[PDB]
Symmetry: D2
Subunit: 392 residues, 4 copies
């Protein structure tokens, strides 16, 4: 089975992604990985969060001469700020007397509302929030995106599938409810300050961000990931855990700051009558065709061949300076929460991470159905299935 794991602290020496169970023969390079990582730098005000200097990407294992080997793929992402943190986040012991004179090593005892700090401190018995926030930080999503690049390459090469995203709403903007983009629209989306597909929505969202920035506040939003070209029959109806919507929901809701996930029209579908809620089927040249995609490409836990549409609701992830009451756990005193990040809105970049998690799940589901140990083998199995479906 395709599996992925991330490791690293935000201010540690490096991040690591390991992907296990990918077939041999998939073409992917360090440049491909760096290109996807660069897409996390996108978005109005993103420079408040990310440093200009790009981190070094190193493929440590599992790829030779631009082709996967079949074994575990380990990718390392450096931390350009490591020299500042090499004592505070040293792996090995440091003289506590030396540490006592390092202002940067001071414990953090005032948990931020909305973050892992409080519950994590209690759970792990930490008197300092540092070990919690270092691992909880959305910097970890860089490692996800490295892993996701492998999944993306597989999906394109094996199935001709493309994954992209666009932003539906930020703050109080009027949601974009038109058709999703296609792959050819990605350049324009990624050139939008808010990674919008619609110009009216783009202007509205930019205005929301400007107003929040002026007020010293922060915003969340809704993003839609779109996967095009999928075959019918990934996922299964045979049990709850095998339903592709279950798997996608796990992967997307597990992203930092995500508080909701929908497939297609989601919560709006729940407000519709059955006569207008579903996608009717009609005869077409090369099989059954639909005129609507309210289902968002999944029915009964499986891909139906329509575009897959997965929406994620992101809470505002940056703590508002001076606004939020908390408690100093060291003393029990009232306190004010201090922020770790200063960006107003991370929704556009969060979209890129949603794409990644969707790609990983889709690649896993494809390998479950089509099997194979090399790309050519998987491709033969796919072709045979496609022929058997066509011959119906």
């Amino acid at each position: 089975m395709l599996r992925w794991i991330t490791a690293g602290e935000s201010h540690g020496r490096a991040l690591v992604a390991v992907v296990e169970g990918m077939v041999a023969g998939v073409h992917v390079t360090s440049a491909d990985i760096a290109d996807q990582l660069a897409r996390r730098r996108l978005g109005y005000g993103r420079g408040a969060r990310m440093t200009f200097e790009r981190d070094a990407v190193t493929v440590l294992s599992g790829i030779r001469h631009g082709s996967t080997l079949g074994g575990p793929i380990a990718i390392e992402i450096g931390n350009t700020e490591w020299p500042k943190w090499e004592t505070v986040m040293a792996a090995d012991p440091v003289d506590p007397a030396e540490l006592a004179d390092v202002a940067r090593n001071a414990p953090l005892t005032r948990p931020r509302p909305g973050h892992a700090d409080y519950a994590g401190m209690l759970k792990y018995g930490f008197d300092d929030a540092r070990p919690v926030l270092e691992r909880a930080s959305a910097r970890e999503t860089a490692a996800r995106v490295a892993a996701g690049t492998v999944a993306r390459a597989f999906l394109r090469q094996a199935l001709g599938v493309e994954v992209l995203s666009h932003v539906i709403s930020i703050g109080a903007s009027a949601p974009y409810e038109g058709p999703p983009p296609r792959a050819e629209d990605l350049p324009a989306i990624d050139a939008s300050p808010v990674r919008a597909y619609d110009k009216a929505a783009e202007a509205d969202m930019i205005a929301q961000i400007e107003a929040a920035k002026k007020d010293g506040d922060t915003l969340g939003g809704v993003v839609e990931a779109v996967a095009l070209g999928l075959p019918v029959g990934l996922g299964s109806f045979t049990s709850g855990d095998h339903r592709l919507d279950s798997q996608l929901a796990a992967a997307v809701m597990g992203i930092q700051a995500i508080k909701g996930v929908e497939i297609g029209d989601g919560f709006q579908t729940a407000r519709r009558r059955g006569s207008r809620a579903h996608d009717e089927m009609y005869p077409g040249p090369d099989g059954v065709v639909r005129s609507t995609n309210r289902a968002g490409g999944l029915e009964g836990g499986m891909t139906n061949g329509q575009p897959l549409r997965v929406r994620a609701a992101m809470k505002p992830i940056s703590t508002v300076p001076r606004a939020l009451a908390t408690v100093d756990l060291a003393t029990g005193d009232e306190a004010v929460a201090i922020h770790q990040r200063s960006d107003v809105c991370a929704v556009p970049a969060a979209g890129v991470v949603v794409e990644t998690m969707v790609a990983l799940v889709l690649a896993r589901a494809a390998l479950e159905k089509f099997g194979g140990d090399s790309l050519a083998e998987t491709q033969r199995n796919i072709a045979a299935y496609q022929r058997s479906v066509a011959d119906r």
Copy 2:
């Protein structure tokens, strides 16, 4: 690790639930299971879907004298309609000539929009939808509820945790946005025709159902499961898959007809400014207290001690008679989809299933943190943790 699996076809001989990894010493009985199963009969018009005769519950393994043994727990739920289906759904071969004279055995070749039928037929290479719909059917949720009863008993006995649900909206009703219920409110909720906690919302929802029923249409809705009494620190921030919101989203989205999941204020949180989106913390007698629960009891992937609130969006699950165009896959001809169920709205009963899936995930997470092989052992570990938290 706590694990659960369901088996059975809707019209097969019986359903089976197996729960593996529950500690010994949890008090649970066949009567407890039957009581939870009875809660699936709740809801206005539910008798259109469920037969009056109650199915037989049999505990086959893993419980002795009302106490779990520590091994796998297998629960069987009979099918009162089996005599009608004992040939059509016979496990063993039947003379195809005999089968040819059984009208009930006719293949189903007109997939219903919104259901597993089409994709499942293609995926598994079936020329008949029967094997797909028999396993995809929400009758399988009975087996889930049997398993969930074990989880519920554990949560109550080990942690003093209660799980309940109430309905937020059905069709175009105005959503109930007030506080959630407590455990003591469950009798009144379960006595409501729409399992509502609010009388205004109840009337509105009943009206929606009446109008849909008159129009020969069907409805979905939104339900909120609520878990009370949880300790701080179930789930973790250490990776996406360990976040309790990820796990809950998987379990809830994997329920038939669910198209969206939210934690707390979910999608509305994405429309709020950071200054009003989160739950501020204040000093209190026995620790930190909050005045709001916008987070729905989870922050950074972990329980924070507030009520857990998980909302599920359900599409309308019953196919509207004569409304939906489809294709006869045998001929390629246009067709009209024929319904398998006739109930207008299954939202209230679906709430009971959401409760079950939440309970299973919570029990698994509790056993992950607190360990133990017997209830008394787990309880000692819980008490020690609670003391260590209190002593802060």
Copy 3:
């Protein structure tokens, strides 16, 4: 992924096996299951352990008209002795005053050396061994064999693979070290009182059993499972857990009373020089051929196309009357262990269980490589792989 789980107590109402992840379209019937279950009745003196009355087999789910459906397959095996145990092993509470008058309900507080009793009592905090021995009992292997029948059917139909076993040694017999049997030899083996393939070894083993029976003692032995017809490349070298020898060792060592597992010549291979330890390769008509199979069909974690040979060492599983000192945990007093079973040797029947566990692992590994959701799909993928190998 193919998964299997067993549930049941020895004296409970029934056993249940559930197999999840088997493809649709595999031909298997209740008669096939009963036939494999009957093979557990084989062996000299087996009637000391098994009652003459055959247990009822019922397929509850996942098979229709003799063909798998693709969903979970649940098989129930009745307990003919249930009426004797229906109070002592009742699932629901019984008046403790009534129980106090039932001699059969007396707690067991004298753990048997060599069994789960002592450690299980301590682990789970039981003051009675009953709940431990009821689940630990090798009666549970009946449920394994039911599950294994599904795996066997798949292996035969998809790959033309056969799994069998023969006994190498019992007690102090001289081990049979000749070639393994082929499928056509199974009738003769199953007709042997000790399921031997060699007549000299058969006589020696029968003599050992006769001597032990006269002395009131018990015996273990060594069995070899053999799987024929496997394709090259099941399992992988990419990590320890993916090595097929790792997976087979887990499955076989997890059988009750097994204390050792070898692949091919195992421990003897460790005593040989490299010049005589391995299987040299030579040109042949339809590919590479070997003249020896010291490796037992696995090299570097993968099938090499030779017969797979897996040997299991079984300790003597029946407690010797009056021989073994133990402690009464209720009092701390010295005691003598009392036996639960009276058979001298269960090695022949244990062989049948080893076959089953090998079949389950092989079926899982085949589905991992070849994928597919229906048998025809898996078969096409297999054929394509076989062609690609042949074309080398």
Copy 4:
């Protein structure tokens, strides 16, 4: 759950180990890791396999100031020979014309008997053995040992458990069948050229190696890992996969070149009568005591408190120069296998790897029973269990 994964090719840039699910608060350092890695350099003739220059160890994540953080722990092990391989094993594409002039890049088309080469080439559709041998190589066991160090630290700190190993036999030596060593014996064992605990066996084994070295041959052997101080009740009898012997067998048999695994007296137990096969129990001051440990510390799938003894049979792992016939898969011609390693015997070093795999499994099983997210929490749970057992 505790999980471990390794990544890396033998001649790649680096190896990586990731351990997920270890509690926070375990004291472990890069020096501890390097010390365990150094123990792989032990053994007569080991310098034929390992280069004098020690590889760099870098802890990338999951440990701060010598204490685990609770998140994933990633450890990197450098490759001192990388400059020689940086083109041949480059991750990114290299001009095939440039590669054509690099003798080191020549494909390997003559699979070695006894290795992954042949089956791996066929499985993955490789025309070159290089990608197979690079990942299959026992160099990967360095990454295992890095991960195992974390497990070892946890076992010592949480449970007072020590894991060690000694060599039982090499080639045709007379096996050492005396008592196992204790922790205090490790210095002497690690100072033995063959890591023997017995002086007679040591001399015999050294003689075997000398004779094989003179004859240009290679040897395997048998090693015993010993774990001391374990609590009663790790593992379970509730299913085959939960039996600790199953889990240990998987972990040990998954080590390169291992062809057999035994618990305690293993295969010899299968040749004994029940009256002499098991460990009788007697009253003692602080509980039940045994006078023998034929069981090797496990009964019914669980630790019984005696020393755990796990034996592994290793085939000879280095290919004998000029001895083994194979086939050139490029041409179909007969060929002779060429060796990748030149050491006569790797049994002593293999023992260190067996220790590591045992430690990982034991740590996982301990965390399953005792739970906890920090060491102090786990320790409290352990103490409470120990008290509850003592109070019996």
